[PDB]
Symmetry: C4
Subunit: 390 residues, 4 copies
């Protein structure tokens, strides 16, 4: 029962919300675990939310200082999709401050990167048993996707990066079988820098839309052949820029070089589904800040430098905070002939953006799946009144 | 193992309480989720309470404002029947502000209606996977039963309404198979307006007792043939009025036209079991307010304009608040030769009725099943001391 | 896989603690459910604690007034044995203020008595489905064991009582199959009054040690043949008195008449294991108050008027509160050739006895099983500091 | 499916963290159970943390006085590995103040020692059913490992001790089958005193590294043949001392006699893996206090008096508290050809060491597994700010 990527993406005309944990709202009183860098991953038995906890809850004095990204008190938890995370409903999967996870159809592989910045090590699990470790190869924050990896025929592909965040680093494409590395490739192609890939599978291939944190306001793309276990990379061709921060959209994009001009923040994790006319990219509404979120239908964004937005759907309005976003698919819906594209938006509350109200930072989550038919509208922000926490 | 509606209703002489969550009482200190519009639905593995949460608990500053019916922070939860809802024991099923759910004997279908009032969309799930979406067709609050739907031979029937609440609207009878629409019927019959149907199955048919929110203090009834997948509608014939608000009972009712005179509130969700002499209707004791609850045995209420109350059983006394009520049956009790009629009463505490004490509104729940033999008596109100919350 | 009572009691030389929930201690801060009248019942999959909740937790303003025995906000919960009861780990089984439960080897039967004092009704469940109801027959607090019933060859025997607590009442011995009454017997024998029987099975028979609340400080005994479904009753023969309150022990007891002289309280639920020389009775250390608890080995207590205490084991010292006590056995330990006698002690804290400290009453629990070999010693009281709650 | 110890230890070059419950941090607000003497034990279905609870949570007035080691309110809980212990996720296994537990591949055996110091009794369970009891044989605190026992071919070996803590006591090696004692051996060999053995299995043998609390700063070792069910004992040969407190390391150790000079505390539970060149011992960084923790690779520490540290890995820095430590292995990882050595460190917060801040004592936990390949670095202390609790 190894998953075989034998389906194409469903056509998508709009997006509906399938889950929203309202974690910060509940967290005003209930013991909600402080998290960030969340994602969603499915398997034959259902779907779960994944997130890096901070070893504390929100209404807890230890929530002070949770703006920090790497501590010894972080780890990966999974909780039932739609539920906010508390101790009672959360599985503590591994220890670390960077992660990915995916199910090959038989067992789940999970990865936590832990340790000091200059001497970190990835811990790899298969079926909840430690199977391998991978030491840092560049000596500067070994790190991975912060969203689910993708499997085919027993092999799961994972993108990892080690080295400087602001200049040339060392990215590797890793192929796993039962939590053991069976092949590695140093990054190839024209992508200058790779961070936090959001991946999805389709017809024996995996496509990753990533984050250039060095030079690019256009997102790098990695293309993987899962039968040959080979990859290449480039940038999205469209002049419509989907990283944050970003300059204004160009009439003509660049398939092979990063587009510079990024006023402030070097990047944010994002995603995209590349399928000719059925192509959709996500992006924060603000080109400066992690606020708002919109889905853009941009036909041939992955092949056409002159491609343009043809449809748009607001998910979170610009008066509300967003954050990371990534792709996921239920690959085990045997009742559908295609893979329905889904995604999540991390809704970051607290610091740095709300530093005058609270001393913590944490997120809630909203998850969306595609519809082949025109749907309605609505905005789905975090929903908490931050002043309640002050 | 598709459910076949091959049984008649059990004879009922009285009602006993099978579950009572005492949610508001517990909610004085424990983290009870704020809910409204609850119901009960069973399947081969047991029965669960369903309810629309408000994305907060009661002892939480976000409980302020929960009188509101439609927000982006609402969704459907199921919790074990008899237990009050907390995060730890609640399944967050979908996002939205109107719902129904039912099990066909193999998989459960659930529906959440979400989005803005003028552009809402129903999200339909089967076995917890998103299967279809249904966009608003009238552009005014697409909405459904707020109690369980009913299945037969793999097909589940759902009543939905879109349009004005106070005048003519557009009601459709929807037939689902594995969460896919296989047939739709625009409302037929003499029912002028349809809201919040409470349905039950019997001998390959489904009977729905609904809420006219436009003109009628007498409840509309929908009759469905589940083999032919056709319906018609009318009103209850009895002059005994079971909506709220309502004028006094008439000596002669009207099978085909609504009975007007409703002093205040246009309606409340209610239910009834129509079975000749074995006919029972529920109603609030007050004809003005959602307070008290009584079961009335009214022989041939569905066929006889001159039908009268012959027996009565107080469930909640008139000094205590009630609310919505609806039907449910355990269709998988293979040890009984008949379907035993059951129902729930929503026990609404807080606003608007207790606005001087608290800023929230939420409910607890009591559930009753029939007995073929004379039973005892007792009143089962919410039980909380509202001033404890002030 | 119906349970067959085909084993004799194990020999018992001493008692060891197998579970202690420390519910009141935990309840100083955690949301522990207010309970009383607890017991323990096993089945093929494990053992659980059962108790009548009060529809509130201890650190909750609704805990005020929980000295009351019968409200509409009570019900039966089961929780894993050894754990204190909270919402997250508790199964809410039925609604009512008196109960019993037992597993026949295939399904569990449970009973809750609910309603007003003058018009109460027992709700009977089998495999969590409502199967029958039993209306009051005497019109004064229909009531049952408050500990587990016992099954043999698909038939479960239950002792119930209806009528005056202080004079002649109407006790019936009920035989159930799959939650349906298949035989009833009005009380027979010389037992004058029967309350709260503690029963256990052995070699196709069930023995119940009960509570005379009218005249007797000696405990009535009911003897049942489970194949013939017939019973008789008498009193324990020993002059050692095991009810509370009680006068001093007599040198000669009375097998057929109650022994009077009870200074204050008319009775307390208790238990005993009758097995010739292997005979053990439990009793509060105080003959006036529900404080302390001791196990007494009294050879032939059930047949010999001159029988005497030969061994003693303190379970709870006299400086600590006890309460109800009852029997249970793991009838599904296929690895043992005999049935090992077990029991529980209800450890009542709060009112009336601690009325100057707190406004509530609730219990914790300690459970003991026998050992055929001499064991050690230790006292196992509730353990809470009541002043912490003031 | 009885476990057969048919594998050797994996080679270990370094250690990675597989779990960290952050219990004290969470316990600032969430209802974390007060514990001490924790360990980890696995079985075919996963791994769980085990610990002796104190019958209270941290933010509970009953946490005052939890420095005490033996009360009637202690017991064993198991919780999912990686999670901090709360009531909702914890299994209350038995009552007592000393314990061990292990799975034979078919059922789990667990042991709790309970009762008064001069008359204690071990309660033995198999598959959660009480199977045997073992009365004290020396009359002074009957006690056992405080970490998992080890099974082979249906037989599980347990080390127990009864008598004086500061002079000659009576240690027995117990062999269990399905929770029944099938063989016992009085301690043999040159080990003068035995406390709190940390055991692991390999090639039909079990090796225990223990605690001499009488004379030795070098740790006693017990060697068991699981087929013959015979043992012997000695000391570690290395002059590198791994108990606490301890004098400085000697150039030459003693395989057969304890090394004295211990300035203060008579001992702490510790562990070691003895495998020639692949030999690793754990130890607190401080030779006086339970602070810090390091793993030392000491080739032939078990056979060579002149053996020396060749590699070192800091787990918890010396500015942070540690405590007990013990071994565990996942014996059911059929995908690995060897048994991977794992261990846990008890991270004790509160009294006596932090008596000026808080009135309680409790621990959090960190668990490590070996890697055959060089790994990174990082310190994993408890992480709580003790002043938050004051
Ligand atoms: C959350 O944590 C931060 C950081 O610990 C807390 O802010 C800090 O508050 C302390 C006072 O308790 C400040 O200490 C002072 O620092 C100055 C130098 O800046 C020194 O001269 C004083 O003698 C004193 O030690 C500290 O500056 C301040 N840190 C920052 C970055 O502002 C904060 O109070 C915590 N929040 C809560 C709710 O506890
Ligand atoms: C629950 O939410 C309601 C609504 O926010 C709270 O009531 C509101 O309280 C604020 C004061 O904090 C009032 O604001 C004032 O409004 C007047 C105009 O009406 C303006 O002139 C003042 O300068 C001030 O802004 C507001 O009127 C009031 N709203 C209503 C409808 O009464 C309520 O306090 C909240 N409850 C709790 C317990 O927090
Ligand atoms: C727990 O509940 C009891 C009962 O409600 C509370 O005791 C009661 O306290 C009220 C005051 O709030 C007393 O009311 C007074 O009654 C006298 C007549 O006795 C009347 O003349 C006064 O005008 C006033 O209404 C009431 O007597 C008293 N009941 C008893 C039996 O003492 C108690 O305060 C509650 N505990 C907590 C912690 O809230
Ligand atoms: C945690 O428990 C300890 C022990 O009960 C508490 O410390 C104790 O505090 C009481 C006062 O409430 C002290 O009682 C006094 O004892 C002296 C003799 O030493 C006597 O002359 C006085 O009349 C009074 O009874 C007691 O000494 C003290 N015990 C110790 C060992 O210091 C402590 O307060 C508790 N912590 C909390 C937060 O409640
Ligand atoms: C899916 O994976 C299996 C296992 O690797 C592949 O089967 C192997 O194919 C290689 C050639 O590439 C053979 O040398 C092996 O003998 C095969 N192993 C087994 C167990 O049959 C299979 O080809 C893969 N599928 C695809 C489409 O590449
Ligand atoms: C229950 O549902 C099944 C599936 O639709 C029905 O069987 C079908 O009947 C139609 C005619 O109405 C045939 O054309 C199909 O070939 C049948 N399908 C199968 C798979 O047999 C069945 O008739 C329904 N039962 C009732 C009483 O209507
Ligand atoms: C256990 O219960 C079964 C079911 O009642 C008993 O079997 C029945 O015995 C009666 C006579 O007493 C027969 O008339 C029935 O035909 C039997 N039923 C079946 C299904 O075989 C059985 O005898 C009981 N065991 C004991 C020891 O009394
Ligand atoms: C594993 O345990 C079994 C059960 O004790 C051993 O099999 C027994 O061996 C003894 C001799 O030592 C025989 O007398 C018994 O007849 C055997 N019992 C069974 C059920 O076969 C087995 O030898 C043990 N394995 C090892 C390696 O010692
Ligand atoms: C409903 O929302 C969609 C966005 O999903 C939008 O394109 C459409 O125009 C809206 N329909 C109406 C009638 O406003
Ligand atoms: C018991 O209650 C029922 C209602 O279910 C009522 O009809 C009946 O008269 C009552 N019986 C008595 C004796 O009061
Ligand atoms: C141990 O306790 C038992 C009670 O179970 C008692 O009978 C026995 O005398 C005690 N033994 C000692 C040595 O005190
Ligand atoms: C990484 O940590 C290990 C300890 O596990 C240490 O031996 C090694 O020298 C470190 N590597 C670097 C590059 O600091
Ligand atoms: Ca960038
Ligand atoms: Ca109406
Ligand atoms: Ca009596
Ligand atoms: Ca020592």
């Amino acid at each position: 029962n190894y998953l075989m990527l034998n389906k194409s993406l469903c056509k998508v005309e709009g997006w509906v919300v399938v889950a929203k944990d309202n974690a910060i709202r509940f967290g005003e009183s209930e013991q909600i675990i402080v998290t960030r860098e969340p994602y969603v991953s499915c398997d034959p038995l259902g779907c779960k939310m994944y997130a890096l906890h901070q070893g504390t809850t929100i209404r807890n004095k230890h929530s002070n200082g949770t703006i920090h990204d790497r501590t010894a008190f972080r780890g990966l938890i999974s909780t039932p999709l739609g539920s906010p995370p508390i101790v009672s409903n959360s599985d503590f999967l591994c220890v670390g401050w960077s992660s990915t996870s995916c199910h090959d159809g038989i067992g789940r592989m999970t990865i936590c990167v832990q340790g000091n910045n200059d001497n970190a090590t990835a811990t790899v699990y298969y079926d909840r048993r430690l199977t391998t470790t991978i030491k840092t190869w560049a000596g500067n924050i070994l790190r991975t996707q912060e969203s689910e990896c993708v499997c085919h025929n027993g092999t799961c592909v994972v993108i990892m990066t080690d080295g400087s965040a602001s200049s040339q680093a060392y990215t590797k494409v890793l192929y796993f079988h039962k939590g053991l590395v069976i092949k590695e490739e140093a990054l190839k192609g024209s992508a200058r820098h790779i961070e936090e890939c959001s991946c999805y599978g389709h017809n024996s291939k995996v496509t990753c839309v990533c984050r250039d944190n060095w030079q690019g306001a256009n997102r790098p793309v990695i293309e993987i052949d899962m039968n040959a276990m080979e990859h290449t990379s480039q940038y999205l061709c469209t002049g419509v820029l989907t990283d944050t921060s970003r300059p204004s959209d160009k009439s003509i994009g660049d398939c092979n070089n990063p587009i510079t001009g990024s006023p402030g923040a070097p990047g944010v994790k994002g995603f995209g589904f590349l399928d000719s006319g059925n192509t959709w990219l996500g992006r924060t509404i603000s080109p400066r800040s992690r606020s708002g979120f919109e889905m853009l239908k941009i036909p041939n964004a992955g092949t056409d430098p002159n491609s343009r937005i043809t449809e748009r759907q607001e998910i979170v309005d610009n008066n509300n905070w967003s954050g990371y976003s990534g792709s996921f698919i239920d690959y085990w819906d045997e009742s559908s002939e295609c893979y329905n594209p889904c995604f999540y938006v991390e809704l970051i509350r607290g610091r740095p953006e709300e530093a005058k109200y609270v001393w913590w930072t944490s997120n809630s989550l909203v998850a969306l799946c595609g519809s082949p038919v025109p749907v309605g509208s609505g905005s789905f922000p975090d929903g908490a009144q931050i002043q309640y926490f002050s």
